[PDB]
């Protein structure tokens, strides 16, 4: 996906809603986050 | 804390201090772990 494209050298930088993950951080470096948010659920009321 | 880190007296600093442009230029900050920022507290006036 996007991470593989970045690692393959096709992409030089990524700007997208990419959630910071430890496994991703092992091979990629994340800058200071521009926003903070968690995970919820969506359901019809 | 910032001066202590700059003076190399302490190699690590954790004191619930925020991150700012004037702070990140002199010392390095890792990924933040607690969400915070600038907020305002007001009384309970109705």
UniProtKB/Swiss-Prot annotation, chain A:
Superkingdom of the organism of origin: Eukaryota
PTM entry text: NMDA is probably regulated by C-terminal phosphorylation of an isoform of GRIN1 by PKC. Its phosphorylated state is influenced by the formation of the NMDAR-PPP2CB complex and the NMDAR channel activity.
Cellular compartments annotated: Cell membrane; Postsynaptic cell membrane; Postsynaptic density membrane; Synaptic cell membrane
Residues that, per the record, bind glycine: 17, 19, 24
Function text: Component of N-methyl-D-aspartate (NMDA) receptors (NMDARs) that function as heterotetrameric, ligand-gated cation channels with high calcium permeability and voltage-dependent block by Mg(2+). NMDARs participate in synaptic plasticity for learning and memory formation by contributing to the long-term potentiation (LTP). Channel activation requires binding of the neurotransmitter L-glutamate to the GluN2 subunit, glycine or D-serine binding to the GluN1 subunit, plus membrane depolarization to eliminate channel inhibition by Mg(2+).
Comment block on domains: A hydrophobic region that gives rise to the prediction of a transmembrane span does not cross the membrane, but is part of a discontinuously helical region that dips into the membrane and is probably part of the pore and of the selectivity filter. The extracellular N-terminal domain (NTD) is a site of allosteric regulation to modulate overall receptor function.
Complex formation: Heterotetramer; the NMDAR subunits are modular and harbor tiered domains that function in concert to regulate opening and closing of the cation-selective ion channel pore. Forms heterotetrameric channels composed of two GluN1/zeta subunits (GRIN1), and two identical GluN2/epsilon subunits (GRIN2A, GRIN2B, GRIN2C or GRIN2D) or GluN3 subunits (GRIN3A or GRIN3B) (in vitro). Can also form heterotetrameric channels that contain at least two GluN1 subunits and at least two different GluN2 subunits (or a combination of one GluN2 and one GluN3 subunits) (in vitro).
Family (UniProt): Belongs to the glutamate-gated ion channel (TC 1.A.10.1) family. NR1/GRIN1 subfamily.
Protein name: Glutamate receptor ionotropic, NMDA 1
Swiss-Prot record, chain B:
Residues that hold L-glutamate according to the record: 16, 18, 23
Entry-listed glycosylation sites: 46
Subcellular location: Cell projection, Dendritic spine; Cell membrane; Synapse; Postsynaptic cell membrane
Outcome following mutation: residue 3 to S: In FESD; uncertain significance
Role: Component of N-methyl-D-aspartate (NMDA) receptors (NMDARs) that function as heterotetrameric, ligand-gated cation channels with high calcium permeability and voltage-dependent block by Mg(2+). NMDARs participate in synaptic plasticity for learning and memory formation by contributing to the slow phase of excitatory postsynaptic current, long-term synaptic potentiation, and learning.
Disease linkage: Epilepsy, focal, with speech disorder and with or without impaired intellectual development: An autosomal dominant, highly variable neurologic disorder. Features range from severe early-onset seizures associated with delayed psychomotor development, persistent speech difficulties, and intellectual disability to a more benign entity characterized by childhood onset of mild or asymptomatic seizures associated with transient speech difficulties followed by remission of seizures in adolescence and normal psychomotor development. Rare genetic variations in GRIN2A may be associated with susceptibility to schizophrenia, a severe psychiatric disorder characterized by hallucinations, delusions, disorganized speech and behavior, cognitive impairment, and social withdrawal.
Family designation: Belongs to the glutamate-gated ion channel (TC 1.A.10.1) family. NR2A/GRIN2A subfamily.
Protein name, UniProt field: Glutamate receptor ionotropic, NMDA 2A
Species annotation: Homo sapiens (Human)
């Amino acid at each position: 996906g996007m991470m593989g494209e970045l690692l393959s050298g096709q992409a030089d930088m990524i700007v997208a809603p990419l959630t910071i993950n430890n496994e991703r951080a092992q091979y990629i470096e994340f800058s200071k986050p521009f926003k903070y948010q968690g995970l919820t659920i969506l359901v019809k009321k | 804390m910032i001066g202590e880190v700059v003076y190399q007296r302490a190699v690590m600093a954790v004191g619930s201090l925020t991150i700012n442009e004037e702070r990140s230029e002199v010392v390095d900050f890792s990924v933040p772990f607690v969400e915070t920022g600038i907020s305002v507290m007001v009384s309970r006036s109705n």
